[PDB]
Amino acid sequence: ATIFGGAFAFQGFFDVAVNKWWEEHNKAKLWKNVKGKFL
Amino acid sequence: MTAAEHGLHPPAYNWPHNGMFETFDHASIRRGFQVYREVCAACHSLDRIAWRNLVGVSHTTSEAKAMAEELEYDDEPDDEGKPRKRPGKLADYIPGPYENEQAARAANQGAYPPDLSLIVKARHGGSDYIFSLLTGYPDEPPAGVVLPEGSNYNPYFPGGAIAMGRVLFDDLVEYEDGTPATTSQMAKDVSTFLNWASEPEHDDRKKWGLKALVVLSSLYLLSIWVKRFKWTPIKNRKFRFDPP
Amino acid sequence: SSIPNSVKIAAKESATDLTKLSVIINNAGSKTGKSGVSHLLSKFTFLNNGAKSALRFTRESELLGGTFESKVTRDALILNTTFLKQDLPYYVEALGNVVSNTQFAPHEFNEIVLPTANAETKLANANPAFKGVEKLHEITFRRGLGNPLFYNESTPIKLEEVAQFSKEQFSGENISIVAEGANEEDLTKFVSESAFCYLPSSSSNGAKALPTNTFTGQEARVPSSGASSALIGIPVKPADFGKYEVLSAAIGTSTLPSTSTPLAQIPGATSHLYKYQDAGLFVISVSGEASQVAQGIKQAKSVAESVSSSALSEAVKAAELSVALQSTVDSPLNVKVVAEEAPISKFNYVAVGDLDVLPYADEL
Amino acid sequence: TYMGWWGSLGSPKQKYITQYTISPYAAKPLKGAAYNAVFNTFRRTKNQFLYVAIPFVVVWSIWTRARDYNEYLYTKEGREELERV
Amino acid sequence: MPTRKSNTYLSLVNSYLIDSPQPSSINYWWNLGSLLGLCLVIQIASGVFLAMHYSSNIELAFDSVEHIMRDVNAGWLIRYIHANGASFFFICMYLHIGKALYYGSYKQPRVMLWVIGVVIFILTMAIAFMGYCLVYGQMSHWGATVITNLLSAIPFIGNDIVPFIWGGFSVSNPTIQRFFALHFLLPFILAALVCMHLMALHVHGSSNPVGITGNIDRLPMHPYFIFKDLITVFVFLLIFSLFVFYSPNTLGHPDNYIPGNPMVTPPSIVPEWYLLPFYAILRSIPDKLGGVIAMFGAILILLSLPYTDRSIIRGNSFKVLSKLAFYLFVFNFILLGNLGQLHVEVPYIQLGQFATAYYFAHYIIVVPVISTLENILYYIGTQ
Amino acid sequence: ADPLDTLREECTKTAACKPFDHHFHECIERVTKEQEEPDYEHKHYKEDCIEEFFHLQHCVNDCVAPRLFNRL
Amino acid sequence: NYQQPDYSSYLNNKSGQGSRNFTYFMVGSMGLLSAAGAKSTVEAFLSSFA
Amino acid sequence: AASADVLAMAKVEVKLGAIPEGKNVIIKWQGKPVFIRHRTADEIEEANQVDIKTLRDPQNDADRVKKPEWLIMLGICTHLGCVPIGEAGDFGGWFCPCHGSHYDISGRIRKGPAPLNLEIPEYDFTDDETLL
Amino acid sequence: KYTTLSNGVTVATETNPAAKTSSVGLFFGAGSRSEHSHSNGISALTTNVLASQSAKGSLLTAKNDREFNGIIAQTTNDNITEAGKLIASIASNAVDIVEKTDLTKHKQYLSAQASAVEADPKSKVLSHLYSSAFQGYSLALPTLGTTESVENLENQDSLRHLAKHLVNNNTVIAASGNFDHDKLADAIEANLKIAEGVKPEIKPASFLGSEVRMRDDTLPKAYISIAVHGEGLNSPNYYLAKVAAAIYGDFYLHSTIAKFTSPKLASIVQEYNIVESYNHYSKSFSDTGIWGYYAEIADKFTVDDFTHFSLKEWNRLSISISEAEVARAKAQVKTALAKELANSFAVTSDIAEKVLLVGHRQSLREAFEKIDAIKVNDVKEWGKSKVWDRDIVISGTGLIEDLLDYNRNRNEMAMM
Amino acid sequence: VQSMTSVVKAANFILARPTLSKIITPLAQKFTAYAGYREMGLKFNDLLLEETPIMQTAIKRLPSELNYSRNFRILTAHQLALSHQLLPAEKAVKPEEDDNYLIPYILEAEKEAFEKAELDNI
Numbered sequence A: 001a002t003i004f005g006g007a008f009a010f011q012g013f014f015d016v017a018v019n020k021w022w023e024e025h026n027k028a029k030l031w032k033n034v035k036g037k038f039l
Numbered sequence B: 001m002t003a004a005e006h007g008l009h010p011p012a013y014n015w016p017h018n019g020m021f022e023t024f025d026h027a028s029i030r031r032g033f034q035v036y037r038e039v040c041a042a043c044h045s046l047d048r049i050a051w052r053n054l055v056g057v058s059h060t061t062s063e064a065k066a067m068a069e070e071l072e073y074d075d076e077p078d079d080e081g082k083p084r085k086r087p088g089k090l091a092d093y094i095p096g097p098y099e100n101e102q103a104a105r106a107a108n109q110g111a112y113p114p115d116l117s118l119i120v121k122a123r124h125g126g127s128d129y130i131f132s133l134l135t136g137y138p139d140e141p142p143a144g145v146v147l148p149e150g151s152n153y154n155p156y157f158p159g160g161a162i163a164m165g166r167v168l169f170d171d172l173v174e175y176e177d178g179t180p181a182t183t184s185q186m187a188k189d190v191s192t193f194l195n196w197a198s199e200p201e202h203d204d205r206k207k208w209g210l211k212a213l214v215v216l217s218s219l220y221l222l223s224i225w226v227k228r229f230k231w232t233p234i235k236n237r238k239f240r241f242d243p244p
Numbered sequence C: 001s002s003i004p005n006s007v008k009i010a011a012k013e014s015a016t017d018l019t020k021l022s023v024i025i026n027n028a029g030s031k032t033g034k035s036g037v038s039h040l041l042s043k044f045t046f047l048n049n050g051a052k053s054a055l056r057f058t059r060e061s062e063l064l065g066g067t068f069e070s071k072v073t074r075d076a077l078i079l080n081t082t083f084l085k086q087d088l089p090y091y092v093e094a095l096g097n098v099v100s101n102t103q104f105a106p107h108e109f110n111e112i113v114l115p116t117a118n119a120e121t122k123l124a125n126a127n128p129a130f131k132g133v134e135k136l137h138e139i140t141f142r143r144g145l146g147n148p149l150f151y152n153e154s155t156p157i158k159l160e161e162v163a164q165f166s167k168e169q170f171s172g173e174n175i176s177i178v179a180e181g182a183n184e185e186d187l188t189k190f191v192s193e194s195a196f197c198y199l200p201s202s203s204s205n206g207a208k209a210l211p212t213n214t215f216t217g218q219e220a221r222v223p224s225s226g227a228s229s230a231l232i233g234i235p236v237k238p239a240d241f242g243k244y245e246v247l248s249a250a251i252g253t254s255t256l257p258s259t260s261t262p263l264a265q266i267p268g269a270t271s272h273l274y275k276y277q278d279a280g281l282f283v284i285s286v287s288g289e290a291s292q293v294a295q296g297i298k299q300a301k302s303v304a305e306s307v308s309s310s311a312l313s314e315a316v317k318a319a320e321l322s323v324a325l326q327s328t329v330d331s332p333l334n335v336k337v338v339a340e341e342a343p344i345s346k347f348n349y350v351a352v353g354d355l356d357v358l359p360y361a362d363e364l
Numbered sequence D: 001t002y003m004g005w006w007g008s009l010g011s012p013k014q015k016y017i018t019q020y021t022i023s024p025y026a027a028k029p030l031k032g033a034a035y036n037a038v039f040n041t042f043r044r045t046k047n048q049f050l051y052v053a054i055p056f057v058v059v060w061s062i063w064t065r066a067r068d069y070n071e072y073l074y075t076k077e078g079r080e081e082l083e084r085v
Numbered sequence E: 001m002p003t004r005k006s007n008t009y010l011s012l013v014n015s016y017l018i019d020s021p022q023p024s025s026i027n028y029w030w031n032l033g034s035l036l037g038l039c040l041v042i043q044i045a046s047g048v049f050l051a052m053h054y055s056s057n058i059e060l061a062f063d064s065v066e067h068i069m070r071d072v073n074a075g076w077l078i079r080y081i082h083a084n085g086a087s088f089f090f091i092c093m094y095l096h097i098g099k100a101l102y103y104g105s106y107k108q109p110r111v112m113l114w115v116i117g118v119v120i121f122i123l124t125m126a127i128a129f130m131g132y133c134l135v136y137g138q139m140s141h142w143g144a145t146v147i148t149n150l151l152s153a154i155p156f157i158g159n160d161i162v163p164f165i166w167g168g169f170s171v172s173n174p175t176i177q178r179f180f181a182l183h184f185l186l187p188f189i190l191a192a193l194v195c196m197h198l199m200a201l202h203v204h205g206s207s208n209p210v211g212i213t214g215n216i217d218r219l220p221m222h223p224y225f226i227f228k229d230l231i232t233v234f235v236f237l238l239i240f241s242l243f244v245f246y247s248p249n250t251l252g253h254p255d256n257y258i259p260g261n262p263m264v265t266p267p268s269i270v271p272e273w274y275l276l277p278f279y280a281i282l283r284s285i286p287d288k289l290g291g292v293i294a295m296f297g298a299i300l301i302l303l304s305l306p307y308t309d310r311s312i313i314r315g316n317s318f319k320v321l322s323k324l325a326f327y328l329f330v331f332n333f334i335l336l337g338n339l340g341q342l343h344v345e346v347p348y349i350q351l352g353q354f355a356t357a358y359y360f361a362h363y364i365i366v367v368p369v370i371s372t373l374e375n376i377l378y379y380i381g382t383q
Numbered sequence F: 001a002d003p004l005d006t007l008r009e010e011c012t013k014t015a016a017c018k019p020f021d022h023h024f025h026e027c028i029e030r031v032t033k034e035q036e037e038p039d040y041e042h043k044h045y046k047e048d049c050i051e052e053f054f055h056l057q058h059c060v061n062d063c064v065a066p067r068l069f070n071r072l
Numbered sequence G: 001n002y003q004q005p006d007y008s009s010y011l012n013n014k015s016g017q018g019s020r021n022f023t024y025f026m027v028g029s030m031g032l033l034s035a036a037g038a039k040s041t042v043e044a045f046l047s048s049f050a
Numbered sequence H: 001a002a003s004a005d006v007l008a009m010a011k012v013e014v015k016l017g018a019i020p021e022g023k024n025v026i027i028k029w030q031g032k033p034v035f036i037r038h039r040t041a042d043e044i045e046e047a048n049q050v051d052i053k054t055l056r057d058p059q060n061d062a063d064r065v066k067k068p069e070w071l072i073m074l075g076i077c078t079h080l081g082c083v084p085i086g087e088a089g090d091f092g093g094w095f096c097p098c099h100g101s102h103y104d105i106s107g108r109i110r111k112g113p114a115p116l117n118l119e120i121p122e123y124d125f126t127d128d129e130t131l132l
Numbered sequence I: 001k002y003t004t005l006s007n008g009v010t011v012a013t014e015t016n017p018a019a020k021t022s023s024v025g026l027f028f029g030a031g032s033r034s035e036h037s038h039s040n041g042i043s044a045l046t047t048n049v050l051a052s053q054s055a056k057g058s059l060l061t062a063k064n065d066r067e068f069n070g071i072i073a074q075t076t077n078d079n080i081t082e083a084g085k086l087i088a089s090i091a092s093n094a095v096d097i098v099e100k101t102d103l104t105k106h107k108q109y110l111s112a113q114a115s116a117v118e119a120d121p122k123s124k125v126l127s128h129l130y131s132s133a134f135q136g137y138s139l140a141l142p143t144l145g146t147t148e149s150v151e152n153l154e155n156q157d158s159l160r161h162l163a164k165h166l167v168n169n170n171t172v173i174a175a176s177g178n179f180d181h182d183k184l185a186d187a188i189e190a191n192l193k194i195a196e197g198v199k200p201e202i203k204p205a206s207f208l209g210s211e212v213r214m215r216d217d218t219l220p221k222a223y224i225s226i227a228v229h230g231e232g233l234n235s236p237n238y239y240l241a242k243v244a245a246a247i248y249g250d251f252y253l254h255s256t257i258a259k260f261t262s263p264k265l266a267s268i269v270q271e272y273n274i275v276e277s278y279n280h281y282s283k284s285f286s287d288t289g290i291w292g293y294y295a296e297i298a299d300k301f302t303v304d305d306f307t308h309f310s311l312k313e314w315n316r317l318s319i320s321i322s323e324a325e326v327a328r329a330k331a332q333v334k335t336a337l338a339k340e341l342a343n344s345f346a347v348t349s350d351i352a353e354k355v356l357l358v359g360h361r362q363s364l365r366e367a368f369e370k371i372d373a374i375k376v377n378d379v380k381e382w383g384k385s386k387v388w389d390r391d392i393v394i395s396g397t398g399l400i401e402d403l404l405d406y407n408r409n410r411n412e413m414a415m416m
Numbered sequence J: 001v002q003s004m005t006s007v008v009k010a011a012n013f014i015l016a017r018p019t020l021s022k023i024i025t026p027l028a029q030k031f032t033a034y035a036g037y038r039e040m041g042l043k044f045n046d047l048l049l050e051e052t053p054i055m056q057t058a059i060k061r062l063p064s065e066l067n068y069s070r071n072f073r074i075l076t077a078h079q080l081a082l083s084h085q086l087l088p089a090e091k092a093v094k095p096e097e098d099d100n101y102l103i104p105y106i107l108e109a110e111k112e113a114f115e116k117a118e119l120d121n122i
Ligand code: HEC
Pocket: B035, B036, B039, B040, B041, B042, B043, B044, B108, B111, B112, B113, B114, B116, B119, B130, B157, B158, B161, B162, B163, B164, B167, B190, B194
């Protein structure tokens, strides 16, 4: 049905919004952003 | 119990990872792992952490692999039946300094330094406690208390007597990123690393939690609206009773 | 017009461009057979023909937009149809196959006829006025016209009786096709080429019409729940149909629902001259609360008599209007309304409801 | 039983009662949600407060007394009374 | 008839969800039942996904749990659910009992229903306790040990039943394995008991906050109280997420993360929070047999409640004194729960004895006395 | 110098922490006096300043906690 | 028949077919958010099978 | 019921030569401690002098110890299990650390929460070493 | 045929030589819709007072419709002209007749009628449905007023009503039968003398989806009615609305054809005998309408089943109606229109209603041509616009415990 | 549950004695006013536990007018609880309208039941 497909729209929207806000709020703490200092 | 028995309650330090939306300071995780290997590995096992767990958290895969080769592990004995050993690999768990609890107790005046892979989730104060424990040693034990031989006084330890004795001292470790190595800095780093080791899902857990709260809060508001809307006919009913 | 069967055909133009075709089986009404046969027969009319079943004929008719019903009257059994002018060749043919070769299957007698007939009887008798009128006909015309108009379980009827009453009736001399808004020549052609051509001229072993034998001075009482009703019935010769139509309209008639008439001044009162081929019954009825009806029927009796001949003459035009209204396609009426005085002293009386309250004939 | 299905719920013969209502899609949803959730909620809390407060006050007073006594017992001044118990 | 009535399966689903003639005046408290059912699913659902990774051997139970937390993909989520969801299951069950105690949902037409309720309660506690023993932490192991030692107080069979429970001479591998098996199982027995609960509910329907008969005004359930069920469910899930994702170990005890060691007893032994009240009662009575009997009575006296409640009016919503008594009872129950976690000390032993005394006095004195007094007061006031 | 020691030094000098430090120091003096007598080993109750130390450390922690990690 | 209660204040200000369209929007949004949450949960659980 | 493999292994023999002439050692029989010990000469004598009547518990050292110097005590310090601490309490024999209760050198519930003197197992000694 | 006399009044007549009887009536609009709560029923009372006058042999009757009122003097053809004069007189002396009238007796008559419409279950159900649907506006009021308001009417109220509404611009003389139109027009012109005045502004009305439940458990059945905002006499969908209604048509369980009626709903409700009877209707007022059904359910446990099935069959209106159903509905609507226009009394009432409320009357042949232009797609477009997912108004009288509250029935309007 | 026979027995035990009457009756009215059921339109007898054969018989033997008034009051109470609102003071049930209308019928039902029980144990 269209429920299955539509669920992807909302899931992806929230997932990308959070996975773009989180690595902005925490960019100073995550690994991928700190690894440069210790390399 | 007496205040001494329960142990002084550790305060609440504003850790970088307390709030609902902050991750671990992975810089602090790496520094804490450095302090661990440098100091704590003399006594503490920390078995449940495998080198693979460090890739993408505090060490690049190459560094974890290299740290793996630096150690020796027991392999399946050769086809001739003789024991054989291999350099460590990522899948291998970090090795403790003692072969068994008997050895650990023998080498520490009978005290058994607990495995640290769950020490943060296995203590009342959590991370704070560890910090308060590592920097809670007073230069002069409170007057009147007599400690059993080999024990050192730490108010945050239940009973007031802990076999550890202060370990973190100023400039004991040269951090890889040039961070100063004050005893408080080392204590914070070790506490953060041990908290990660006891809660490797912390960052993923809180991110999933944020997504779940967003979804469920929007959905709960929608449900509130839908219920009030579909109940408007009932809450707006008006009756009359007109008998003769 | 007529065909070799002697089936009369009457056709005349209509105002509302509907061919209100109707067939009037002259003496297949409730008077002819044993009590209630005509009702069941009327319920069998349109169900299963030798040409189209019920579920086919009804569906086709509804597609064509037409309506059809079968109503039982004490004189004749009427099969009414109503359809657009384009639709005559269909319905007429169907009507033929209704009079001839109607199936009368037992499963219809048990599933569609007896249940429906019982429901109609119960619904009609729930009205105290109609129960009173049936009793009035019973006690005024003891047989024939007094037969109950609807099937009642008190007189069991088996399918064979209804089938044998369809046969031995429905004959050519016994049916009169009447239409409104259909060319008489086209209708004659359709009837001649329909199944009506195959009906026998007369019934060989039935339809022995009996004399009317009007009885007066009688009375009856029929206890009933709910609303009560008191009725007064004057049997009248056909030649008197004019006198009483003027009388009824003078005091108030069901066909003319209007205030300001003497009978309309009392609650629930009405009058009506039921007209039949060989006799008629003038009924003055009152209905409602038993206490109200008790005085209402006496007031209505006093009103029917003591009606000024001047007002009776004034009511002639209203009576002519009422006759014109009644003369539908199915029930052709030819009554000359004269102002001649109409007596009431020969009345039958019937009471229904709270018999402890309703008066007896001796109180009028 | 004391509750039948919809046709016969066991309600006594009900009569003369007329129930009017308007459709949704034709009524203001959340008509007074904001004002009611404050004023009416405060009214309900005011009515029901004492029933929860008097038992709560009693139980929490007992608990506070017990807790303070226990804290006092385990101190350098409560040692003697702790021994006597 | 509509497909939702002609088909027997859909007919049942309709009778219970779509056309159940619920009363129109039920608060949000009546939603708790649905939540409980929801929780029963969650406990089962996450539960079935933990046994797929949990190894019941005593030498593997704790390591297996840590493998779930650390190694399985969403294993941390499944464990935190299965645990905090049990805590929330008991929160909702205590709220469902509190609602049934405040409103007279236990009175005449539903006494049978109430009985199943109590049984469910009892059964649930077992399940929860048993499941907790599966973690085989310090507190897990020593809770099992204390429980079995207390059950060793039965007059004659006590010395023999305990080895049958332990499957040995102390909490060991057989004990943990049988606890795992019975813990996987008993939730389905509880599902059957919940079905019986719903049948006993459907026979006479649900009560009202006003207590009076709802038959005069009953509403369907599909457009009404299903969308109220959604509010309650989403609030439940929102708080459940605030716990599972943020501070998931708040309700648990830290000592449970130390692998079980019979040779060292931890400083204090406490059940998981929701069993603390009864545990307190158990300690209030000195005799071990007395303690276990008193505890199981503290659970079973709910059965006596519908007969000790001599109230002519159903429910407390319109009763002054009975509301005070009910709230005092609730706060004493919370006080018992609090004393459960506190050490047996000078003031707390006497306070717990008094709290247990009043807890039982509620059912056997206060409810009958207060109900009779209020019946008389109602009649005298109206006259 | 590490921030933690300087924070403790600053806090213990605060007015709120002053009475606790006072009580703790005269407790130390009193316990030393008790240790001076030759019969100390025989005393059943040998006093100690654990409680005063705990009060002082709690009142100092309540001050250092919110500020410390701003220093690291 | 009789005088109905005055609903003037309760009546919505919005169009006849518009408010139901908005109701459709939010009911479908709730359904699809629930579907997304169920997808996330089911995927997380089944990932344990791997 | 106990399954042969669990049912056997109940004996759990532990060698007694290693313990100091006066010391407390812990043996894990039946998934519980069996705090054993060999009595010191002064301690054995001190107990003989101590009056059973003085203790609230109705027990005596002579009944508690089968073989004189070598005696067996179960690990739980208190009637409700308390992990046993060493050399603490009213007599300086053991501390019921779970509640901080006092356990005597006798092992009786000398002071605090425990109801009775520590339960004694089958302290059967065969020559040099013994089995609970 | 039309002729606007002096005074501006219009005489509209539909003469047919085949007419059995003739009729002529004066209608002056302003039925209950022109009243208000305090003075409701005054139009019916005034019309009854006028119609109670001496008939001079004719049959003088009152109309008392929702939006228009009038007095009709039925009479045989040759007498028509006399009747003409009669009504003209009755209306040129309307104020005098009202003044000289003792309204007591007429008020008990009107109260008896008002009780009648509140006892006949169908009349009560439909009156309540109209009241709730148009609640807040004058159109909600009963045609005949309520027993509480009738008793409170006085002569001055009727005089004010006549003065406001009995004016040339608001009155029409309708006639039918077999007579020369010019003769009747001339006879009325010489005798009609009514006050001048502007056509009163017709009060507004707007449909409001609502539910009213007069549950009387003492009745033997459940008399319910459900309808949506229909099509007024002005709307070009008028006949389209009638066709949509006839698609579902009538049904009486005990009728012989009950097992053979075409409509699908009839076949659906006979499987368990869900309903005893029902009839679909499209009531049309001047500018707004009510399109729906009335139903009587004997088994009190199957009201919900009937409502569910009927609303599902309505849902079919916008999706799956076949050319067979559309053709049947067209034919049945044409036949019903022709039946409604047979009696001269009905023709006169229809002429008055149309001329007063829409200004122009479409002949029956024009109506047939307009209906025959309907295709199935037009019916489905109308179903989408007016039936699919539109608010419904509900009414019920007895044993309606099983009639689930609004939301269930309303949601049934859009489920596939 | 307590029988209306016993409730009335106790109430008349109290009312007969002037001291207890004076002490209680003011408290009885105060308790019934604080009960808050009158603010929802309910009379006291509407609150009675209907779900018992005795009480079911009592309602089943009520007059028509009392039965319909009880139905309307119960429906009004349900609606008020549903909408979380109370009747204004002027519309609430006054103390004098709380007339104990259903008590006599319940007492008759209990009299019948008690006689049946006594005679079954004759
Ligand atoms: C050398 C030996 C070390 C070193 C280098 C560290 N620890 Fe610690 N540890 C040690 C002993 C002898 C003990 C016995 C504890 C006791 O007497 O009860 C411990 C214990 C701990 C604990 C337990 C705290 C508690 O149970 O309350 C923790 C936590 C701990 N150790 C952690 C720890 C950390 C973070 C270290 C950093 C370098 C560390 N230890 C060093 C002996 C030793």
